[PDB]
Design a binder for this molecule. Structure first.
Ligand SMILES: *[C]C1=C([C])[C]=C2C(=[C]1)N([C][C]([O])[C]([O])[C]([O])[C]OP([O])(=O)OP([O])(=O)O[C][C]1O[C](N3[C]=NC4=C3N=[C]N=C4[N])[C]([O])[C]1[O])C1=NC(=O)[N]C(=O)C1=N2/[C]=[C]/[C]=N/[C]1[C][C]C2=C1[C]=[C][C]=C2[O]
Ligand SMILES: *[C]C1=C([C])[C]=[C@@]23C(=[C]1)N([C][C]([O])[C]([O])[C]([O])[C]OP([O])(=O)OP([O])(=O)O[C][C]1O[C](N4[C]=NC5=C4N=[C]N=C5[N])[C]([O])[C]1[O])C1=NC(=O)[N]C(=O)C1=N2/C3=[C]\[C]=N\[C]1[C][C]C2=C1[C]=[C][C]=C2[O]
Lengths: 499, 494
């Protein structure tokens, strides 16, 4: 029945909002639709895998909020294996390489590639993290898909192919489905292209020893019985003095304040009284989540290490079920495993097959890519298709189709009376990640502490001190990288010497 | 509690599905979220307007299902006023014309305009009505917004402006928000561009004497207490023998079968057990509805008629709140009124203003466009912003963004166990219209009669005889129209 704040959803965002509110002295109830916490993070434990993240997993430098929350809860990180060579597989052939980026040899191609990654960052510098619709060319960029932007920028097929795979990997969606403004914002707010794509020194450097699921789990341990499992919220009433929140299993909760810590579109699953304002009413129907299957294939040993590969594969082409892999072996060197994502339209297509048919297609790809028969000899397999989840809607996160971010963007974290909004989609730094869930969660909680007159307005957005355990190297460019011209740029320099 | 079929939603689609099922002898319950029926149709009555459709309104030839259901319920149509000249207002100036299409004088422009309309129809002829994702070039067309198509096709800004207005009017959405495939399908499935845009001989020929809201109303009359108002469906259980449907106000219903007669995306408002299959689970998050405000300004007389205008204005530019108008005067010649739509991003912008501020912006525009002071002298005003409606989501209908129709399109009317799907979005002829709501309703009903073994498989999709009251003239082109070249075409010949 009664409390200070009801928090809808017990994902990392929800759970962090509740921990902060509870730490301040308030009575909080967490209402969770599922028979578990973690939401888009999930750690499976059985004797074959010991543990494994089937959802959100990677953390790295500049993500200091999740690093600190998890450290306070007693968790450690280990480094993802990047000791040996990465592999770029392209037109059915594998090209090993070190350093974060696959090298490019053809000099026209090299100019195209260097110029695309650079323009992404150039364009990002014009887009404010906390208000992407305020970019100078916001309308123009939002009225274009990433497919159109790529068609314009990329003067070689090789760059366009690589860029496309980047978009798919990064946002689990096709280039033609996403707003250019949105995607450009999404990359910028993670610290730019290098930070977002890297293992060493980037978004993929690390994982939690024991799995990311322990973050949500351990906050539930702190909160005890204030977390209610199997309580899908169906109904929110704001017409009376206190807010009434109703659940499917028929309970009623009453509070001063609500934090909604669910995917924006999952707000649809709740009936509102009074009705939502028009903008939010239509916004929650415009913001789908991408499609992905996360697959892990176990082997008796990390056999790729012996051929001097780390396990990272960037695999091109339509025929490949999985376009990106990472070593998923434990710190100890056991439970050898390759993690792979089946992305976007391929998550839709290959969902038709059986678990076993997917296992096979993957082993056959890895065998081809790593050039190793051993890859046909898996000891175990685990997969999750996030597309089938009623209480996630997809993964990793929410994408914005063309024309939406500028028309409805401002509305995402605009409070509706006594409803305040968390969830990683409303974050301003690493939105779409476990990091952004922690940011949005703590900031929504702090918005309420302000409404309650417990803290000053200037205390709502709070900066985070850098992890001492996971420090960030700065992102460096070279002189040439900065100043070498585009393909159209070389061309113009040729039409000018010739005259 | 118990019955044969629960129909979720009491719009025209739901209501037609229930009428048919009940006419067969089955026990049907209609569960309606609102305190009224009609859904996206709504007739307001007060002394000032007598009656007015604030939602779906127009009907015309080739829409035989709505014509017939309405005739059987005792309704009549009248013809929308198109006796005097239409007006094309372009770059701040008004160009009156007769015939369906605003004429084009500059010969390069003429070739661009003729070609754009013609390509739309050519493209449509390769898109199957009942399966758009089976068009030969389905992926290509679906991976492109209408904005990209228009940028390719249109070699003059005048054609591109006119086409863009056409897109906004027709689907209440911006050219950059919509799949090319989807919009091209939408137009073809209404009989092509001429059919969809015309008054005389098209989708805008007619209205119902008394308002279109009487269709839903009268069916509720027939069904009496089988219609439950203020029952938002919150939960559907298919795990047990009979389907269990729960409502917000706390009642439980039990049936052999469910028809869902709501906007696809409004399916999100319902928790399912078992969970929906993956494709539908995601699909219902990918399919928004457009944004529109329907506005009707009353005048003591239909003054435009005296200046030899009918009331139809096609108004260009960003500054104009309303891009399209029609005469909304009653058949008798009284309650003079201009109906106008505020479309797409203009619905979102102008929603910030007050009712009165919108009235003024509109009167000033009409005064300018009709060139009459009388337009500044309104006697009454009514408007509805469909964007604010929790149980509609927007109007007129659902649009498909790029890449969605081919990836999820096959899933819209695929039954989920014992749930079958109606609502105009699942129609194959005038989907998006009251006509499609009737088609999808009767066909979802007939799918259940088949599941029950009451009718053969070949009787699920049934053809409709032509209205004798509202007959269709055939769509004609001229020799020149067919064979005159594009702009790039003239160029190549040079
Ligand atoms: C799924 C996923 C996967 C598979 C993967 C990934 C991901 C995911 N990610 C993401 C994450 O996870 C997220 O962000 C988080 O988790 C979110 O959170 P939040 O905000 O809190 O929310 P959620 O979780 O969802 O929660 C919610 C809750 O609620 C509930 N509900 C609903 N409804 C309702 C409820 N309740 C009551 N009532 C009602 N009505 C539910 O149930 C829940 O619980 C991630 N992240 C991170 O951080 N990391 C990672 O790793 C991840 N992952 C991903 C990754 C990827 N990566 C990649 C590779 C390479 C690359 C990339 C990217 C980019 C670039 C590159 O290069
Ligand atoms: C809104 C609108 C407007 C404003 C206008 C218009 C329209 C609209 N339209 C459309 C119609 O109306 C539609 O289609 C119909 O109505 C639909 O129906 P259905 O399918 O049945 O569905 P609905 O209505 O929505 O219903 C549903 C129901 O349900 C319910 N719910 C929900 N949720 C729930 C429920 N329940 C229980 N539970 C739950 N959960 C709701 O509430 C409801 O009731 C139209 N149409 C026609 O036909 N006509 C007309 O007029 C119309 N409108 C329009 C028009 C326009 N036009 C234009 C001008 C010129 C042009 C155009 C177009 C194109 C071209 C051109 O040129």
């Amino acid at each position: 029945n009664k409390c200070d704040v009801v928090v809808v959803g017990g994902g990392i965002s929800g759970m962090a909002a509740a921990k902060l509110l509870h730490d301040s002295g308030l009575n909080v109830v967490v209402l969770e639709a599922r028979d578990r916490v973690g939401g888009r993070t999930y750690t499976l434990r059985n004797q074959k895998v010991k543990y494994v993240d089937l959802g959100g997993s990677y953390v790295g430098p500049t993500q200091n909020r999740i690093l600190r929350l998890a450290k306070e809860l007693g968790l450690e990180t280990y480094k993802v294996n990047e000791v040996e060579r990465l592999i770029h597989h392209v037109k059915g052939k594998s090209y090993p390489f070190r350093g974060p980026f696959p090298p490019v040899w053809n000099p026209i191609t090299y100019l195209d590639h260097n110029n695309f990654w650079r323009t992404m960052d150039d364009m990002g510098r014009e887009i404010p993290s906390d208000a992407p619709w305020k970019a100078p060319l916001a309308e123009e960029w939002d009225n274009m898909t990433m497919k159109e932007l790529l068609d314009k920028l990329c003067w070689t097929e090789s760059a366009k192919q690589l860029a496309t795979l980047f978009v798919n990997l990064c946002v689990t969606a096709e280039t033609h489905e996403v707003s250019a403004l949105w995607f450009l914002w999404y990359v910028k707010q993670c610290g730019g292209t290098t930070r977002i794509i890297s293992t060493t020194n980037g978004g993929q450097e690390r994982k939690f020893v024991g799995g990311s699921g322990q973050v949500s789990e351990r906050i539930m341990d702190l909160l005890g019985d204030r977390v209610k499992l199997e309580r899908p919220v169906i109904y929110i009433d704001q017409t009376r003095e206190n807010v009434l929140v109703e659940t499917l299993n028929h309970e009623m909760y009453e509070a001063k304040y609500v934090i909604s810590a669910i995917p924006p579109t999952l707000g649809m699953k709740i009936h509102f009284n009074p009705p939502l304002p028009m903008m939010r009413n239509q916004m929650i129907t415009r913001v789908p989540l991408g499609s992905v299957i996360k697959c892990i294939v176990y082997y008796k040993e990390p056999f790729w290490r012996k051929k001097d590969y780390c396990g990272t594969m960037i695999i091109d082409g339509e025929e490949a079920p999985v376009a990106y892999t990472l070593d998923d072996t434990k710190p100890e060197g056991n439970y050898a495993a390759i993690m792979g994502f089946i992305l976007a339209h391929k998550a839709r297509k290959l969902a038709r097959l059986t678990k076993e048919e997917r296992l096979k297609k993957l082993c056959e790809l890895y065998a081809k890519v790593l050039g190793s028969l051993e890859a046909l000899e898996p000891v175990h397999y685990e997969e999750k298709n996030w597309c089938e989840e009623q209480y996630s809607g997809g993964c990793y996160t929410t994408y914005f189709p063309p024309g939406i971010l500028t028309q409805y963007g401002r509305v995402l974290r605009q409070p509706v009376d006594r409803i305040y909004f968390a969830g990683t989609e409303t974050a301003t730094h690493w939105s779409g990640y476990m990091e952004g869930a922690v940011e949005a969660g703590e900031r929504a909680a702090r918005e309420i502490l302000h409404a309650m007159g417990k803290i000053p307005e200037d205390e709502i957005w709070q900066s985070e001190p850098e992890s001492v355990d996971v420090p960030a190297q700065p992102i460096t460019t070279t002189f040439l990288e900065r100043h070498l011209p585009s393909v159209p740029g070389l061309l113009r320099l040729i039409g000018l010497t010739t005259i």
